[PDB]
Amino acid sequence: PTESIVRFPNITNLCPFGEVFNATRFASVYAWNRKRISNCVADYSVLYNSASFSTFKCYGVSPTKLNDLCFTNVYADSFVIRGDEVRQIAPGQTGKIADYNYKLPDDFTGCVIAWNSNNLDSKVGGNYNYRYRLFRKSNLKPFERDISTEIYQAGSTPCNGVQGFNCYFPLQSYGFQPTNGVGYQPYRVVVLSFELLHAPATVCGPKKSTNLVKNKCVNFNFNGLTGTGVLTESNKKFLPFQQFGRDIADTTDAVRDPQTLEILDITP
Amino acid sequence: PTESIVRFPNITNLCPFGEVFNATRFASVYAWNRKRISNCVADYSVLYNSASFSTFKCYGVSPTKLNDLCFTNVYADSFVIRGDEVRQIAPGQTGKIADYNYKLPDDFTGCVIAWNSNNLDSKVGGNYNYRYRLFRKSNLKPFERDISTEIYQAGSTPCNGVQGFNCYFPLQSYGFQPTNGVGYQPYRVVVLSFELLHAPATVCGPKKSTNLVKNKCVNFNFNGLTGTGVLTESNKKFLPFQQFGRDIADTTDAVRDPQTLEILDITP
Amino acid sequence: PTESIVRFPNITNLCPFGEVFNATRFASVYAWNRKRISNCVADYSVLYNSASFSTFKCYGVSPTKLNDLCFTNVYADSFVIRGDEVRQIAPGQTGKIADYNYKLPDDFTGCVIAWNSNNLDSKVGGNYNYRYRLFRKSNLKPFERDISTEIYQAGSTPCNGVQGFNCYFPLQSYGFQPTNGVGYQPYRVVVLSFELLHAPATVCGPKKSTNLVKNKCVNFNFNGLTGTGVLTESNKKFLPFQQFGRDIADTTDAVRDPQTLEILDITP
Amino acid sequence: PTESIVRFPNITNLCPFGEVFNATRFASVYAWNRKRISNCVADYSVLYNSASFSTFKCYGVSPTKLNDLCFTNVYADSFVIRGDEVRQIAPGQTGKIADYNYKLPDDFTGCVIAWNSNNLDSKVGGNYNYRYRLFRKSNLKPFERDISTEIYQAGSTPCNGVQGFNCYFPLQSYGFQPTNGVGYQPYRVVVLSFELLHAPATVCGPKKSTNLVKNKCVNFNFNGLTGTGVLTESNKKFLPFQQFGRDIADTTDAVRDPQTLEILDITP
Amino acid sequence: PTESIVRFPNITNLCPFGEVFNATRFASVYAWNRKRISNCVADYSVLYNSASFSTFKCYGVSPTKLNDLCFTNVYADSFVIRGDEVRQIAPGQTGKIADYNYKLPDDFTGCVIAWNSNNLDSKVGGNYNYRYRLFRKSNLKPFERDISTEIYQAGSTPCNGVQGFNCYFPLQSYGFQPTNGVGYQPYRVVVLSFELLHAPATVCGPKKSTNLVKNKCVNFNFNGLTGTGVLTESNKKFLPFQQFGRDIADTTDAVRDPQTLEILDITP
Amino acid sequence: PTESIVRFPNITNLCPFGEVFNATRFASVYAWNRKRISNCVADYSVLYNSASFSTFKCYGVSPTKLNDLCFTNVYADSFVIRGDEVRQIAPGQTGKIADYNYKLPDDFTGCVIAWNSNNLDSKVGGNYNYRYRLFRKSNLKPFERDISTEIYQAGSTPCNGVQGFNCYFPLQSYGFQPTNGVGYQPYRVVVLSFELLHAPATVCGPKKSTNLVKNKCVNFNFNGLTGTGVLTESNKKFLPFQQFGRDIADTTDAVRDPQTLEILDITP
Ligand SMILES: *[C@@H]1O[C@H](CO)[C@@H](O)[C@H](O)[C@H]1NC(C)=O
Ligand SMILES: *[C@@H]1O[C@H](CO)[C@@H](O)[C@H](O)[C@H]1NC(C)=O
Ligand SMILES: *[C@@H]1O[C@H](CO)[C@@H](O)[C@H](O)[C@H]1NC(C)=O
Ligand SMILES: *[C@@H]1O[C@H](CO)[C@@H](O)[C@H](O)[C@H]1NC(C)=O
Ligand SMILES: *[C@@H]1O[C@H](CO)[C@@H](O)[C@H](O)[C@H]1NC(C)=O
Ligand SMILES: *[C@@H]1O[C@H](CO)[C@@H](O)[C@H](O)[C@H]1NC(C)=O
Ligand SMILES: *[C@@H]1O[C@H](CO)[C@@H](O)[C@H](O)[C@H]1NC(C)=O
Ligand SMILES: *[C@@H]1O[C@H](CO)[C@@H](O)[C@H](O)[C@H]1NC(C)=O
Ligand SMILES: *[C@@H]1O[C@H](CO)[C@@H](O)[C@H](O)[C@H]1NC(C)=O
Ligand SMILES: *[C@@H]1O[C@H](CO)[C@@H](O)[C@H](O)[C@H]1NC(C)=O
Ligand SMILES: *[C@@H]1O[C@H](CO)[C@@H](O)[C@H](O)[C@H]1NC(C)=O
Ligand SMILES: *[C@@H]1O[C@H](CO)[C@@H](O)[C@H](O)[C@H]1NC(C)=O
């Protein structure tokens, strides 16, 4: 391996992590706000190295390596919970938030970023505008959003839309005050989930593309696909929707150049 | 009485509470900051209607009735403590902040205003820029300020100005973190002391001044002096430092108007 | 005083304290249940000797001297509150229950009897059927019950009968669990308020009457009217509503006998 | 498998769990009560649906599947402890109850049911009738009790069974009050121990016995012996104690019918 | 008033406060040790200037003035209690220590000293050598001890000297741990009660006497009896047991010398 | 296996564990004290018998088997830390002590022995003599000691050798009170480190040295070399640095007798 060749798509616009994180008002956890992120350079070490997030805990990927990876789509799910419920944003965990408000799948790949928000989300006398769903008949499916407001029937009597004995509203207020304990303290949570599935990659890190060298042994990083081999011209006519190539041994022997749209044969 | 005549003097500028309360940085408790406020208009109801002040304790005045009474001079004292010693900013209270950092007289008149500033004065990894005087050979007198950094000799041996065995540095750091408990979270405290000595009033509130009505039994408030009488015209010989006259009964019977310099005979 | 004479009306049915204290379901604190107790004999010893009432606090009446006094009418107010809200059931106290749910007068005469009911009012998973009023525009008057359920306008926008941002339901659930700490455990509260008017006393204790002794110096207890003097047969005519004979000097001169209906002058 | 066939013995007398769980007074933890349950149909639904059991921790068996299985002998160990020491009733923990009062084996197959009993085991002024062994020479063996009252020597002095300096009574009282916290509140604990040997099962659930359908491929459940097969009429001569039968390869190939005492060959 | 003439008796030996306050082992609170301090000089400002004592509350006298007074006798009561029970050592208090172990009179002239002894009295594995009386039929008279060990019958059944159901041992061990809470460390309490009989005082403070100067208007401190006057030779002879000479105004004008034992007359 | 043989070298002197564990004053954790224990007999059972130690965590070796083995060298480390920071003395653990003060290797062979020291290290007025490094530019490598007192720079502003804004002293005083909780409580930690590497072993347990039995099948522990075989004479030419031989199968077949320096042959 004489050289190393990194080829990423030629994109420059930064996708708004600022509008996800530095928003004035977030949403409640029963109505958590999901933003689609695609076609951007994403500097994850801006979020990592900044001393502002108490929890930057990442599942299925390393937080330091996120600049050196490319994902097809990023989902940013922002909401506000209490501190003791910050642990509940994890696969294979139980609680009110995990069962009824926000559920993470067991194959989750992404990061959970939680930081304290006392000055923004508390008020003397109580901040009651952040509600969590307390009552539901069944647990939530992963990434299912439930915003329905129907009176929960906890007994045998029908409720008919009126709260009362054994008939409760499903949404319950946090009631934040700045004098509250650190467990009952407002924490803003943003969950980044990365689609690593077979698709064209849109969100890529700030790594700079190098020029293409052929007919030599080079390490290569084509759109997040890492390998070592000899890149040459290929007579393989790719159909325009195809990015990779593959053989009977299930090995990537052909890739499409992200920039020049050139099909390169990877001879090992 | 028929109507009330409130006479406040011709003052146009506002009292500078803005850099007292909304400053970017506050000083520490050992170097507690003091601002002298005089000769302006102060609207205390803005501070009273705030939804962020957790503690608004007052002494010698009512927390409702502070705006209508108007004062000689306002001493605004600003410092950052943590939440446990907010009770130590009370008169007669004993503690490390009370004995060694900031001591209030037992006859203190004014209001203590404190609010949590965890999003401002705490950083992830620790904020150590706010210090308190842990050691002093004598307890502080009321309202004295000690910023000396001399090494507190706690043993018999002279160690000559270095930290070591029983040779402690007098200041120590709070060490604020955003994940700390509410006792160990930063609280910005602004003591607002007011003196009520025999002097003409310099700070008075946003209450409007009404026109004079003479020769009729009216309730009057002549710039802090409230009475009932038939405010007739005068022929008195008031020297220009004489705010209000007296008599053999030691009762107020002649007041010179603050807005026109006209002496008025009070007759009940 | 040679002898002691006690005359109480010949009433024999017990007061229904068993219906008050041993009811299966107590109402919520916002809808506290008042029962009027009159025309019976009240045995307060069964309340006092039994050891389950953790809080037994009487105001204006000595708690061990409940039996000898006679009362006109008794009001028993029953409800369920959490453990830290028990101290607010007292004259002159403040809190959410005192302001918005149940306010005692500052001149309150009677007892507060609170006992733990964790077995009867908590189920595993949460008992959400006990609600307290959390939002009100103004504090309650003494002995005033508010069961209104209109949406509380916290902000400047009209609520229009729907819960949402800055519009809250005034009632909030306790959510009792048996694993919750004693601050957050159910306590059943019965407040006995005795009124002592100029009306004839109907609620009298279990003290038994003696025979009347006339023309001799005795110490008498005439239906709660204690005193000492020579009871003599009188020619005074009382009208049927009149029960005793206060003179021009406002001292009791004659008493109507509560059993035989006899007019009895008191000499000293 | 066309259908499911379940054959259980026709025992209809219900197992005495009412005497275990609803006894008027339990025993102290040093003298914990053990009851032998056998030869009855057991209903575990009344334990699971009940909303008073705060702890239902089952080791080795699924708590929902207690109703499904059959056992031979059930050991019910009932006692009263305090809340913080409920966590000591589990296989493999330490503490005063685990070491000196009640030890659970590491191979424990059974459930632990703990519920709060503040209404029944606490008295205002203290309930000191519940004792625990505080001092012992060596830690207890599993399922061993020590009701001995011998004065524990904690020094080097033979003090002849008299309490005093370094000679302590082995048993110490709890002293339960309703105002005490949940760490120091009474919890009644019933430990159910199921033993499953190579023995005929006497403790089973209320699952109904269906009619005998032979010569068809059925799922079958013969007295807890689950499987799938084509049950036919046999010619094997089982001895009366011999319940099922095994082939050369130690697989169940014949069973006796629990109801009609008939030998049925299980061919697959 | 030129110069004071302090005359205190020529007492040679210091009071044994060191043996009381510095003893190795203190007695338990049910069997507290009382020591009679008399015929000596006692420095009380040594105790105050030492900062080891957490509590120094003195009732009926000020702690700083104690070196200036001659008391007739001193009683030193030393015991070990819990921290939360330290407040029970006060005149007019309720609790287990006040009712059953150590009762202070309401007319108390003395000082209460309490210092933490987690270092010397606590021990890992438990120090159960300190016991307190938990059960008694009646409350204690002031300065009364109970060393009885009879079984407290709390039911109808007799006990026959055997512990069991409703029969409890009167004394319960404390169980001191070094890992206990702030209310549960051992505290050693010395109660110094100053007997002030109208007698020759024998416990005097450390004040250097001044030789007698007569026939001039001087201050004097004769045996703690402060006064101002002219001291003259006395014509009358007082009885050998009687020192104070009272007048019609109940003021001493004829005092015996506490060094040369001769009568002196005080005149204005 | 007829006769067990234990051959240890003839080492007479006892190890100085008294001067390490029972030292009067320990060093602080930034300047932790390392003592080299070699060429003595060590009794670790008497370390294990004491119940004063609240943590006796041994990593890689079991505490019961400590007397069995032999070591070449022992590293006895000693320091004082608070109770919450005891857990950071562990392999593969993070914290202030682990990063900045004392780091164990990830594969550590030895025992962490920590006991509470409230009685020895606390004093009234606070013991601030114990300091810990709170600020460092880089994390400590394992078994590396840093005693630098250079002022740590946090901001871009140079410190210039004085304490100030964003320039802190790297060492912080603990502040131990006798009234502190168990979290801030002084704990004395000794970390014994053992090397299991093959060398002439100098420190061994108190096991008795048996005689030499030859030409009989015996168990043997030759300086901690456990095995079973028929120990016969050898003609192998062991050099002085060669202590135990090995065969072509890499098994121990010839061991030098530690007492005699005589070469013996293991034969199974
Ligand atoms: C949010 O704003 C702050 C400004 O104080 C900035 O430092 C931070 O980087 C911003 N975060 C994002 C994600 O843009
Ligand atoms: C950018 O990429 C596109 C294809 O995605 C390609 O057609 C174009 O030539 C590239 N431009 C440059 C300057 O590399
Ligand atoms: C403004 O102030 C001056 C002096 O303070 C006073 O004489 C004058 O009357 C005031 N102006 C008005 C319009 O009253
Ligand atoms: C500080 O700034 C906020 C920003 O809205 C303002 O509402 C508040 O009144 C300011 N405080 C003072 C004392 O002016
Ligand atoms: C409630 O019922 C119990 C039954 O055990 C009884 O002891 C108690 O006296 C009753 N309460 C009243 C107020 O009578
Ligand atoms: C009972 O009281 C009534 C009046 O309330 C009276 O008429 C009647 O005589 C009394 N009974 C007796 C036996 O005195
Ligand atoms: C105990 O009694 C209650 C009374 O309703 C009943 O619901 C419960 O099922 C009983 N417990 C058992 C184990 O049968
Ligand atoms: C019930 O079972 C027994 C054996 O357990 C059997 O002898 C008896 O016949 C059965 N009864 C019926 C009605 O089948
Ligand atoms: C000391 O006191 C005695 C009486 O107790 C007295 O007789 C004697 O004179 C005194 N000593 C002096 C030096 O005055
Ligand atoms: C107890 O001993 C210490 C040790 O020197 C001493 O400082 C203290 O003064 C003594 N206390 C008394 C009352 O003598
Ligand atoms: C420390 O001294 C005590 C004194 O009794 C002794 O028991 C203990 O064994 C000593 N510690 C060690 C580690 O030997
Ligand atoms: C002790 O061991 C040495 C070798 O380590 C040996 O030379 C010496 O003779 C031995 N002494 C005794 C008394 O066994």
Residue numbers in the entry:
A (entry chain C), B (entry chain F), C (entry chain E), D (entry chain A), E (entry chain D), F (entry chain B): 322 to 589
From the paper:
The Delta and Kappa variants of SARS-CoV-2 co-emerged in India in late 2020, with the Delta variant underlying the resurgence of COVID-19, even in countries with high vaccination rates. Herein, we report cryo-electron microscopy (cryo-EM) structures of Delta and Kappa variant S protein trimers – both in the unbound state and in complex with the ACE2 receptor – to gain insight into how their mutations underlie changes in ACE2 binding and antibody neutralisation escape. Within the receptor-binding domain (RBD) of the S protein, both the Kappa and Delta variants share an identical substitutional mutation (L452R) with the previously emerged variants of interest B.1.427/429 (Epsilon). Finally, the P681R mutation (present in all B.1.617 lineages) immediately precedes the furin cleavage consensus sequence (682-RRSR/SVA-688), with initial reports suggesting that the P681R mutation enhances cleavage, and consequently S protein post-fusion transition.
Each RBD interacts with two RBDs in the opposite trimer via two distinct interfaces, henceforth referred to as RBD1 and RBD2. Interactions stabilising the RBD1 interface are primarily mediated by van der Waals interactions and hydrophobic contacts between residues across this interface. Additionally, homo- asparagine-asparagine and glutamine-glutamine hydrogen bonds at positions 440 and 506, respectively, and a backbone carbonyl oxygen–amide hydrogen bond between residues 372 and 445 further contribute to the RBD1 interface. Additionally, two homo- glutamine-glutamine hydrogen bonds are present between residues Q493-Q493 and Q484-Q484 from each trimer. This latter interaction at position 484 is of particular interest as it is uniquely mutated from glutamic acid to glutamine (E484Q) in the Kappa variant.
